[PDB]
CSV table of C-alpha atoms (C1' of nucleotides) and ligand atoms in Angstrom, one decimal:
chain,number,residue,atom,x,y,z
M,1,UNK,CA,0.0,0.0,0.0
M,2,UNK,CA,3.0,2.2,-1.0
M,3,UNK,CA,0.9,5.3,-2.3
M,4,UNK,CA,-2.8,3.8,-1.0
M,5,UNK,CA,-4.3,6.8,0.0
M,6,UNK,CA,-4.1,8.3,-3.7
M,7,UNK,CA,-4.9,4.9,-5.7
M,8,UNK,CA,-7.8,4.4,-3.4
M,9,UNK,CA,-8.7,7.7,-3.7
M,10,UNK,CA,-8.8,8.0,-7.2
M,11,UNK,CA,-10.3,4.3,-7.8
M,12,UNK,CA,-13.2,5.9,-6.1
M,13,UNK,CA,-13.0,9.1,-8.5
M,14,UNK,CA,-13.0,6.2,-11.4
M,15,UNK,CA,-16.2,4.3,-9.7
M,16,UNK,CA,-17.9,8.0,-9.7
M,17,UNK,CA,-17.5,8.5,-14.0
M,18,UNK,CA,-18.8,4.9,-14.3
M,19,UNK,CA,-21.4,5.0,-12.4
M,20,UNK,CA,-23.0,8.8,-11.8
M,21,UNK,CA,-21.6,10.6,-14.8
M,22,UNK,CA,-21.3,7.3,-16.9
M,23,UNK,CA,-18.3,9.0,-18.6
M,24,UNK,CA,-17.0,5.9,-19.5
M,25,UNK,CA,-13.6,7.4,-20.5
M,26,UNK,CA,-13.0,9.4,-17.5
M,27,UNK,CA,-13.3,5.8,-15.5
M,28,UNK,CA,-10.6,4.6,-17.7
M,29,UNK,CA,-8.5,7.8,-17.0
M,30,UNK,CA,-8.4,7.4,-13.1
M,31,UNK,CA,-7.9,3.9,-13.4
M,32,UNK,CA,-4.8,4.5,-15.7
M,33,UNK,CA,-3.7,7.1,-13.3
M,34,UNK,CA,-4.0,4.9,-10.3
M,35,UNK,CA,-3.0,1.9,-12.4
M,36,UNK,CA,0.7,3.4,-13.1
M,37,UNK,CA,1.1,5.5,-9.8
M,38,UNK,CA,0.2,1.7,-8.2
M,39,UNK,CA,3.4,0.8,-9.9
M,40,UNK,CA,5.8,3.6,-8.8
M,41,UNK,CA,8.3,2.2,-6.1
M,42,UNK,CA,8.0,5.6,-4.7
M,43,UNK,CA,6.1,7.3,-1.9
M,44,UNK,CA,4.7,10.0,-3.3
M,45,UNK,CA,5.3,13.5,-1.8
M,46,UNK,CA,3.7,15.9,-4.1
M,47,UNK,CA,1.5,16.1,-7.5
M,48,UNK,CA,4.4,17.7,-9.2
M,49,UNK,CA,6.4,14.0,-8.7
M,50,UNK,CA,3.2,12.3,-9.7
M,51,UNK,CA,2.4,14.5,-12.8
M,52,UNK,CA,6.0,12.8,-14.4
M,53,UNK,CA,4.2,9.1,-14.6
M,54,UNK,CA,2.0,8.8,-18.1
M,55,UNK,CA,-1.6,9.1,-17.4
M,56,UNK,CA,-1.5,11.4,-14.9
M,57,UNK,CA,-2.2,15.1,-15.4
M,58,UNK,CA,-3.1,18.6,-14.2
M,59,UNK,CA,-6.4,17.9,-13.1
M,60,UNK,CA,-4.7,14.6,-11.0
M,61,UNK,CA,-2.1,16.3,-9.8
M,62,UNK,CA,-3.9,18.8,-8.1
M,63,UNK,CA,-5.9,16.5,-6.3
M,64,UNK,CA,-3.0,14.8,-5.1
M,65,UNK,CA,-2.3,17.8,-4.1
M,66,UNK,CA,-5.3,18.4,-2.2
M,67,UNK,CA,-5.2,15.0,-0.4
M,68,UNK,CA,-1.9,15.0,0.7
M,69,UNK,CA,-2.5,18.6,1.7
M,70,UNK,CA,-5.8,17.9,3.5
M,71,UNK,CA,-5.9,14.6,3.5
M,72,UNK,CA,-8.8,14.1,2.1
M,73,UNK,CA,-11.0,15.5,-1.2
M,74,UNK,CA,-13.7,18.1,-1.2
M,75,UNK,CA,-15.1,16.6,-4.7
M,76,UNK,CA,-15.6,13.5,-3.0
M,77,UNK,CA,-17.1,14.5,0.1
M,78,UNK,CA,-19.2,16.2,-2.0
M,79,UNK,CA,-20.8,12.6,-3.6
M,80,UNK,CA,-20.4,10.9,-0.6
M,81,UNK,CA,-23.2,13.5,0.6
M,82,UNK,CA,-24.8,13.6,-2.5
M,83,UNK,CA,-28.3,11.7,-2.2
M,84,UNK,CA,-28.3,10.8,-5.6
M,85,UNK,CA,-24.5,10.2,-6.9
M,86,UNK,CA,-24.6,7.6,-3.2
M,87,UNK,CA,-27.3,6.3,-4.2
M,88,UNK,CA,-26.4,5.4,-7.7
M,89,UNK,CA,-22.8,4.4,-6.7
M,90,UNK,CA,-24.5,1.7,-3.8
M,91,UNK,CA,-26.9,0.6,-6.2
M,92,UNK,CA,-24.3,-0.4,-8.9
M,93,UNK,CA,-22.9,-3.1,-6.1
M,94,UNK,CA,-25.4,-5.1,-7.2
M,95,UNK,CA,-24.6,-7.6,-10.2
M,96,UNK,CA,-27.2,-6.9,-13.2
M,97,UNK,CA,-27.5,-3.2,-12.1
M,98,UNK,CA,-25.5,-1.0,-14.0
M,99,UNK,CA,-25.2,3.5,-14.2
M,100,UNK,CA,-28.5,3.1,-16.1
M,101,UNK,CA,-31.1,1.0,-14.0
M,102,UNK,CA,-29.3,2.3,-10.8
M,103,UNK,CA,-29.7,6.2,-12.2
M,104,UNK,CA,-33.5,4.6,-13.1
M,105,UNK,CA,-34.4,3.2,-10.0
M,106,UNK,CA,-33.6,6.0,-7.7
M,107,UNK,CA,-35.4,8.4,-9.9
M,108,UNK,CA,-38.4,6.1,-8.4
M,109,UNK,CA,-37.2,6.3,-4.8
M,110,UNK,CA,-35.6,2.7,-5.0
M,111,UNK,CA,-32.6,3.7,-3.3
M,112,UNK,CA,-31.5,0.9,-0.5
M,113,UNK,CA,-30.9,-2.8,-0.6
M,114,UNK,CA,-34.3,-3.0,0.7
M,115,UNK,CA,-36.5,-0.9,-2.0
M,116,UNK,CA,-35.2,-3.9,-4.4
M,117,UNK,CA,-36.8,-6.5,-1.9
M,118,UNK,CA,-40.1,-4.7,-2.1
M,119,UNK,CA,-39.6,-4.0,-6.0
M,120,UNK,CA,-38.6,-7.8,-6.8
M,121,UNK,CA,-41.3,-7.2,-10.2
M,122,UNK,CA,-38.8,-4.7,-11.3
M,123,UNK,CA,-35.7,-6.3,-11.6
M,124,UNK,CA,-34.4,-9.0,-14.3
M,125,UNK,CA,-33.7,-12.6,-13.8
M,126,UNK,CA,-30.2,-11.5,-13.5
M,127,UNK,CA,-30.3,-8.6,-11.1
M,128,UNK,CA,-32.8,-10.8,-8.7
M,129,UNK,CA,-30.1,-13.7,-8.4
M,130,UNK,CA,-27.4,-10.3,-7.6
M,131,UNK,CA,-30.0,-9.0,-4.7
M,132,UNK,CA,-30.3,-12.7,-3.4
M,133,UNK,CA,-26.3,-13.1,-3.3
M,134,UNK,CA,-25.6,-9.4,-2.8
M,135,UNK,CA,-23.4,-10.3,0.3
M,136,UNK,CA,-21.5,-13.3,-0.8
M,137,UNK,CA,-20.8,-11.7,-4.0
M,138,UNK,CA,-18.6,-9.0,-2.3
M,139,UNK,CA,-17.0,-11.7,-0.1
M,140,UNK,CA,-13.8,-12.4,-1.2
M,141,UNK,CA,-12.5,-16.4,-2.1
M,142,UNK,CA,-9.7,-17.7,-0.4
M,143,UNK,CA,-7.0,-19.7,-2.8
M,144,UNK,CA,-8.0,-22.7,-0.5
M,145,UNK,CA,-11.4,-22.6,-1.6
M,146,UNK,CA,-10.1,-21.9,-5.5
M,147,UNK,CA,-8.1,-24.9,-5.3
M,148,UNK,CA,-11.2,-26.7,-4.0
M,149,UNK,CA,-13.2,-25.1,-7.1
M,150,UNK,CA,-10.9,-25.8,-9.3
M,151,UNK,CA,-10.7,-29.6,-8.8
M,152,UNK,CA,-14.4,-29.9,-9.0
M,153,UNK,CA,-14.8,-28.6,-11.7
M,154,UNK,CA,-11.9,-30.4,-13.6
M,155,UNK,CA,-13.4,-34.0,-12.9
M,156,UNK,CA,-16.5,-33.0,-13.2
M,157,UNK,CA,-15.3,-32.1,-16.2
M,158,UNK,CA,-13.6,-35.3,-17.1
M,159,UNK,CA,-16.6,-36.9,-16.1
M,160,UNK,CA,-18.1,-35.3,-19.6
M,161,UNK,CA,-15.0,-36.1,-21.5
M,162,UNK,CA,-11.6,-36.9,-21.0
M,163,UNK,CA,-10.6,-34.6,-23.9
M,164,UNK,CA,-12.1,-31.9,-22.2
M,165,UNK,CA,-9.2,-29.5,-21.3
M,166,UNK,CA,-10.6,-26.8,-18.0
M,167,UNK,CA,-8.3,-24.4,-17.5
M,168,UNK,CA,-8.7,-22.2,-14.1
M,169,UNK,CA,-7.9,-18.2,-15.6
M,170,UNK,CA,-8.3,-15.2,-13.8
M,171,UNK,CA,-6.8,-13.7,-10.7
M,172,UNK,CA,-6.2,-17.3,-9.3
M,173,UNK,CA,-3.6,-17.7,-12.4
M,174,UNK,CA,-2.0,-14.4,-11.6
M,175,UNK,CA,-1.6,-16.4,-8.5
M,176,UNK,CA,-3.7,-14.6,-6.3
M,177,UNK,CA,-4.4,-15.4,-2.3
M,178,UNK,CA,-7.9,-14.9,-3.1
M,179,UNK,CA,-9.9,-14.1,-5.7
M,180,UNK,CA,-13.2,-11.9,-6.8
M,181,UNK,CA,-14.3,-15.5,-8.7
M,182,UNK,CA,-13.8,-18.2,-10.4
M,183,UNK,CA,-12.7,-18.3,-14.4
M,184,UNK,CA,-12.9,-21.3,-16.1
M,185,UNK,CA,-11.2,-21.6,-19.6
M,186,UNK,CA,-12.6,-24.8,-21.8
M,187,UNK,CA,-11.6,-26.4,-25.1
M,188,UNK,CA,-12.3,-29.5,-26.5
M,189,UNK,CA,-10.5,-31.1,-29.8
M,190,UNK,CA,-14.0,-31.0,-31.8
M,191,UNK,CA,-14.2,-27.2,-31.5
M,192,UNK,CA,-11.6,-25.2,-33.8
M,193,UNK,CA,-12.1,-21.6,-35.7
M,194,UNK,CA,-13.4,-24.3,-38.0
M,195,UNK,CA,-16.6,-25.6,-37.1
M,196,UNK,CA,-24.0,-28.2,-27.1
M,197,UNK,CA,-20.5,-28.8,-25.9
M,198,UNK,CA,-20.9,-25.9,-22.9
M,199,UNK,CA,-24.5,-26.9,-22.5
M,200,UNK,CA,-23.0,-30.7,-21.6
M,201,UNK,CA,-20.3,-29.0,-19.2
M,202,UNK,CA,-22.4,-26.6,-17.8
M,203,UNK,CA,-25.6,-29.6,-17.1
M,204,UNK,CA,-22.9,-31.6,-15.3
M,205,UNK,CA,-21.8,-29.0,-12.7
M,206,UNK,CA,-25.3,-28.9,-12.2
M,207,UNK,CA,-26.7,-32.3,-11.3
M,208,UNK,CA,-23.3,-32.6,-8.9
M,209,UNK,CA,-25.5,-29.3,-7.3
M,210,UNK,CA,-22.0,-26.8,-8.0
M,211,UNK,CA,-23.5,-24.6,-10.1
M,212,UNK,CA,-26.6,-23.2,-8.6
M,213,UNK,CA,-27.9,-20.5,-10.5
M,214,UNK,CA,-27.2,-19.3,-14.3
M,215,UNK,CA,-27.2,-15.2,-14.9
M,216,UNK,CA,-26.4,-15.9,-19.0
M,217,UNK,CA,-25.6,-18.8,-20.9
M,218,UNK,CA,-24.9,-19.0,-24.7
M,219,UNK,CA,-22.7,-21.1,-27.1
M,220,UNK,CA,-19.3,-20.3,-26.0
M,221,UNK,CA,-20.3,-18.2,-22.9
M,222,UNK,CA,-22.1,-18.7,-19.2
M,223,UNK,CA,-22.3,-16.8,-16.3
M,224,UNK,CA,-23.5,-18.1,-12.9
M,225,UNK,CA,-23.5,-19.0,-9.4
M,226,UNK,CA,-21.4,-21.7,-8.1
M,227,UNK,CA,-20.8,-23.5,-4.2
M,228,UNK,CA,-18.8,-26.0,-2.7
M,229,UNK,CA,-21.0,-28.3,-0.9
M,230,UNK,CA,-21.4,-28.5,3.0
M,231,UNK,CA,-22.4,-23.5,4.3
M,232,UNK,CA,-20.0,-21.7,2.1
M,233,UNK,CA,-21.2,-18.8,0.6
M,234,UNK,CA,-22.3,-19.0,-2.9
M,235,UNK,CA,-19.5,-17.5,-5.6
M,236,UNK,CA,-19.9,-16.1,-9.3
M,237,UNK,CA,-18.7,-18.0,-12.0
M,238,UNK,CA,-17.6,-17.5,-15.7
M,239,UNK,CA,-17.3,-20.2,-18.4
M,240,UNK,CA,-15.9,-19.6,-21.8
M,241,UNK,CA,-15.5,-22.2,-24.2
M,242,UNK,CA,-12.9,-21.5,-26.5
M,243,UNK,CA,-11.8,-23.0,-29.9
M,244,UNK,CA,-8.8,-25.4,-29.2
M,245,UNK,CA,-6.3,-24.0,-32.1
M,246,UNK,CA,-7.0,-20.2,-29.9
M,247,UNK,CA,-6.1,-21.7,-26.3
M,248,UNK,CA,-3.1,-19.3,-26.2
M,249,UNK,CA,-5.0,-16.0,-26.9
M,250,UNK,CA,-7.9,-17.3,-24.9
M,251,UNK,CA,-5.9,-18.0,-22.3
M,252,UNK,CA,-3.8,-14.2,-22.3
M,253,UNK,CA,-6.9,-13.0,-22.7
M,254,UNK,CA,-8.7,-14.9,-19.2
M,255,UNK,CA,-5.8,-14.6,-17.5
M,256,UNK,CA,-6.2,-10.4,-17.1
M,257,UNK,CA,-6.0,-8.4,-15.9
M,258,UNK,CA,-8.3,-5.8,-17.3
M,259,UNK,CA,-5.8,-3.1,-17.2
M,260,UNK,CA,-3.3,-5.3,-18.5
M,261,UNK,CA,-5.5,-6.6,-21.6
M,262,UNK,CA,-6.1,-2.7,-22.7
M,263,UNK,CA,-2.7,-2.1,-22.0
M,264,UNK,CA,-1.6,-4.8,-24.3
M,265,UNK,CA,-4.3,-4.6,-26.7
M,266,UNK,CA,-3.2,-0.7,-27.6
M,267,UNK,CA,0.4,-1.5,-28.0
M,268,UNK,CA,-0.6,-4.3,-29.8
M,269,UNK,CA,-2.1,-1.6,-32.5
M,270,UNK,CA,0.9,0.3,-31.7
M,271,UNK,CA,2.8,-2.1,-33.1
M,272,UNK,CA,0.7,-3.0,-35.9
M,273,UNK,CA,-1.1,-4.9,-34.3
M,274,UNK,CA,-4.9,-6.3,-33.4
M,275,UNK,CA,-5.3,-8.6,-30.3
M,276,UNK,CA,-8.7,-10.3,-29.2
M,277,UNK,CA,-9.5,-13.9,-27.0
M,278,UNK,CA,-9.1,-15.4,-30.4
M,279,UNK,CA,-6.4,-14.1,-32.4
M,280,UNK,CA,-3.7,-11.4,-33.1
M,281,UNK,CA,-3.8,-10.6,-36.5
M,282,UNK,CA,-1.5,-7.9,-38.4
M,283,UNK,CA,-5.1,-9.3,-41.9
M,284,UNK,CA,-5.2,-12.7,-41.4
M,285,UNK,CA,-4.5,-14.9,-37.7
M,286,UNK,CA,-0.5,-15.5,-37.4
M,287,UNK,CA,0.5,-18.8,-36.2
M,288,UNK,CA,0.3,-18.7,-32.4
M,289,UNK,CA,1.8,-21.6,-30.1
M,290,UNK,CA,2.3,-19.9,-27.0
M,291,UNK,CA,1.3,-16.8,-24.5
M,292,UNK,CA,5.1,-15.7,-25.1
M,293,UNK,CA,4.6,-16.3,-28.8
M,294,UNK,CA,1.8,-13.2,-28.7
M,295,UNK,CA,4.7,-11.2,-26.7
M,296,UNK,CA,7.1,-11.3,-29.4
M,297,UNK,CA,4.6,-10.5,-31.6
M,298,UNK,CA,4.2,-7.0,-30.1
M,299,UNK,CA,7.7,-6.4,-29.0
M,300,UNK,CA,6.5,-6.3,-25.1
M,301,UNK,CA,9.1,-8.8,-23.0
M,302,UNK,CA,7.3,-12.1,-21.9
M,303,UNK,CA,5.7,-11.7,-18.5
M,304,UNK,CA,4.6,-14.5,-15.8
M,305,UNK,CA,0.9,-14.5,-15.2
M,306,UNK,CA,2.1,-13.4,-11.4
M,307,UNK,CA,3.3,-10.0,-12.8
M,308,UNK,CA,0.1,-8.8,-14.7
M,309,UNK,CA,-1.7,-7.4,-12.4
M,310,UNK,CA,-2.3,-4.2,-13.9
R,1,DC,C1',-6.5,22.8,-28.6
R,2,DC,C1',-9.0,18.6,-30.3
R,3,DG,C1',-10.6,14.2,-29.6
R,4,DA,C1',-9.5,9.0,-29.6
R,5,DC,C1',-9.3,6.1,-25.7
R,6,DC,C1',-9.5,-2.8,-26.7
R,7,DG,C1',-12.5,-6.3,-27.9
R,8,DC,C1',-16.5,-9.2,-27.5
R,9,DG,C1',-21.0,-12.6,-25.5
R,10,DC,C1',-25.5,-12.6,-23.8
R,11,DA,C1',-30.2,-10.6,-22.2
R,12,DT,C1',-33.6,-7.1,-22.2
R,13,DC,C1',-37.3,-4.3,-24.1
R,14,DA,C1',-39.0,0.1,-26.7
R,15,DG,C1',-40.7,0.6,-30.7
R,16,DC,C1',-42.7,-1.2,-34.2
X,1,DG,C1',-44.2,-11.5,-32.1
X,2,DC,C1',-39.8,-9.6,-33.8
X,3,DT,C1',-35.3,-7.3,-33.6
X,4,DG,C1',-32.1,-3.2,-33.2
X,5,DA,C1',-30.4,-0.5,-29.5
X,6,DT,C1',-29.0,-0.6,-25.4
X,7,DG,C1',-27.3,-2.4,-21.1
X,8,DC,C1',-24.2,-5.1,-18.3
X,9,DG,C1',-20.3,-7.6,-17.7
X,10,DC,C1',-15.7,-10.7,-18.9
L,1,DG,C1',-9.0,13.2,-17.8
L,2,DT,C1',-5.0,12.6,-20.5
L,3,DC,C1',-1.6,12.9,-24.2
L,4,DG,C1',-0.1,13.0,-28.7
L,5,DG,C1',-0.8,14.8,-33.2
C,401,LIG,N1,-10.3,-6.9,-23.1
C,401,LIG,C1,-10.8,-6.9,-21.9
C,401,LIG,N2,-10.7,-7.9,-21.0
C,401,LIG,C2,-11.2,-7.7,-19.8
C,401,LIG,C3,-11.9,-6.7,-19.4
C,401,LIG,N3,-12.3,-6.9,-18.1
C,401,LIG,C4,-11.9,-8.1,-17.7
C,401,LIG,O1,-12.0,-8.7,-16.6
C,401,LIG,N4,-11.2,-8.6,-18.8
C,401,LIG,C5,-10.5,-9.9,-18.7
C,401,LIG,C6,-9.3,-10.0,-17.8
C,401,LIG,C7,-9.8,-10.7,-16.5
C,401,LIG,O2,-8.7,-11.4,-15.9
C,401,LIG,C8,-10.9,-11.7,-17.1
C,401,LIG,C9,-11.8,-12.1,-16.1
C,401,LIG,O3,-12.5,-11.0,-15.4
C,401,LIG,P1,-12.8,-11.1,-13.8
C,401,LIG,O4,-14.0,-10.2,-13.6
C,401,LIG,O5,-13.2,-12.6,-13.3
C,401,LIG,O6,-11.5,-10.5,-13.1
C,401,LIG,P2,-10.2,-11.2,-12.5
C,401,LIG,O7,-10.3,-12.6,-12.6
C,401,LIG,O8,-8.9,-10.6,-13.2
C,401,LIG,O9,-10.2,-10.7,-11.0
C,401,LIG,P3,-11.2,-11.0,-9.8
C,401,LIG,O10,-11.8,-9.7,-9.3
C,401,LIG,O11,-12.3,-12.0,-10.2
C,401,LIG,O12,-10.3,-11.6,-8.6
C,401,LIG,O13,-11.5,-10.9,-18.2
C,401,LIG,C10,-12.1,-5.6,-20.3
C,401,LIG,O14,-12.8,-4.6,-20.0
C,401,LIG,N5,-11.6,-5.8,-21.5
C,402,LIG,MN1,-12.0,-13.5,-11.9
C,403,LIG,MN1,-15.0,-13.6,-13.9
C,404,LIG,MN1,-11.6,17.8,-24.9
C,405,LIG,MN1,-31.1,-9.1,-31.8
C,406,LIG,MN1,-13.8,-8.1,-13.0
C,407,LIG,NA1,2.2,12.8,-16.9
C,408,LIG,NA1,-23.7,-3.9,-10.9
DNA sequence: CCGACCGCGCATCAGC
DNA sequence: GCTGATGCGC
DNA sequence: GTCGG
């Protein structure tokens, strides 16, 4: 927590555009800010030092200013107080309410936790299964439980097909001591960028009573509640089924983080570039066999998963 | 100063 | 009933 | 909000 105060600080500036302003931009700016500040091995003693880094500016640097100054901000006092922007911003906790119904429902007077219990008629299939697990979805998973997941799902797995190949992404292949969910990364041999194999997986992790509740489910794609059995608290998560011959982008592409994807992504077209979960094309898809493979690509040195975070 | 700022899967519902 | 426009999220 | 064109 070298420089804390202002990461936190401006993560909650970012939270703000999202949410209240829905400046969508802006949320990436703070995030960049905090992003690269998060990375200086320096305690930071004015704006002036942090206006050197790359993504932060004037605006920034002032508030630095102002919170090492004051140690705190006026601008966020100022929507912590706010009826509204609060209101918005505590709303948006819940998973299926974004800046839009939030903004929507408190123009209605559905502002707490409980105005959605009285309102269940209003909300989606998806945003009902986010009130019921509002608390355990903002609990935290410890790597033991992870490890737990992930071997329940990979014979489970099995269990479908032993050519099945699960691969655990996400935080917990960063390496993570806990993680925000779990990400699970499947391919299969019959599956290529040539031509119900989720459906199968996903059916299976249901009789075995892991995966409780679905948010969004599609061909290559599901979303939805998981558990390890006797109580745990119930845990999101994600499936993506990707085409074998694209495990490699897939897997860069799971594996995060957020930050790091856009990061890569741009210099990618820096570079000449075009990186998605599939390929990276200059064009057609060059030959990938590798994660390393797509950093040479882009003239970016080869990092472990462990040294992503972003 | 202006304005681009990664890439994509699934669900919902206003407006026909 | 249908389907883009839009929303939400990875 | 930022930075490069
Ligand atoms: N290109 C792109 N990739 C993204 C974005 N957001 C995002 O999470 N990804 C990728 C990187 C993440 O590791 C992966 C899974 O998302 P996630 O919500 O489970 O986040 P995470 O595993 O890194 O972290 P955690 O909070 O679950 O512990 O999806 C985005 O906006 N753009
Ligand atoms: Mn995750
Ligand atoms: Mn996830
Ligand atoms: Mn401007
Ligand atoms: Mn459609
Ligand atoms: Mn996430
Ligand atoms: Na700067
Ligand atoms: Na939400």
């Amino acid at each position: 927590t070298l420089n804390g105060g202002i990461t936190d600080m401006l993560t909650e500036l970012a939270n703000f555009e999202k949410n209240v302003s829905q400046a969508i931009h802006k949320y990436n700016a703070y995030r960049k800010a905090a992003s690269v500040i998060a990375k200086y091995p320096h305690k930071i003693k004015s704006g002036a030092e942090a206006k050197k880094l790359p993504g932060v500016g004037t605006k920034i640097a002032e508030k630095i200013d102002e919170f090492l100054a004051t140690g705190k901000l006026r601008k966020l006092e100022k929507i912590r107080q706010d009826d509204t922007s609060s209101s918005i911003n505590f709303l948006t906790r819940v998973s299926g309410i974004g800046p839009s119904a939030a903004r929507k429902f408190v123009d209605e007077g559905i502002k707490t936790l409980e105005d959605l219990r009285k309102n269940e008629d209003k909300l989606n299939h998806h945003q009902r299964i986010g009130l019921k697990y509002f608390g355990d979805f903002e609990k935290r998973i410890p790597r033991e439980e992870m490890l737990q997941m992930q071997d329940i799902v990979l014979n489970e797995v099995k269990k479908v097909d032993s050519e099945y190949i699960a691969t655990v992404c996400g935080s917990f292949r960063r390496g993570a001591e806990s993680s925000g969910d779990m990400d699970v990364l499947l391919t299969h041999p019959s599956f290529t960028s040539e031509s119900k194999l989720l459906h199968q997986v996903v059916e299976q992790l249901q009789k075995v009573h892991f995966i409780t509740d679905t948010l969004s489910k599609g061909e290559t794609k599901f979303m939805g509640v998981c558990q390890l059995p006797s109580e745990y608290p119930h845990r999101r998560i994600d499936i993506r089924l990707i085409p074998k011959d694209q495990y490699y982008c897939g897997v860069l592409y799971f594996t995060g983080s957020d930050i790091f994807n856009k990061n890569m992504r741009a210099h990618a077209l820096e570079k000449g570039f075009t990186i998605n979960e599939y390929t990276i094309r200059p064009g057609e898809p060059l030959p990938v066999d590798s994660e390393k493979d797509i950093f040479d690509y882009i003239q970016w040195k080869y990092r472990e998963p462990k040294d992503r975070s972003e």
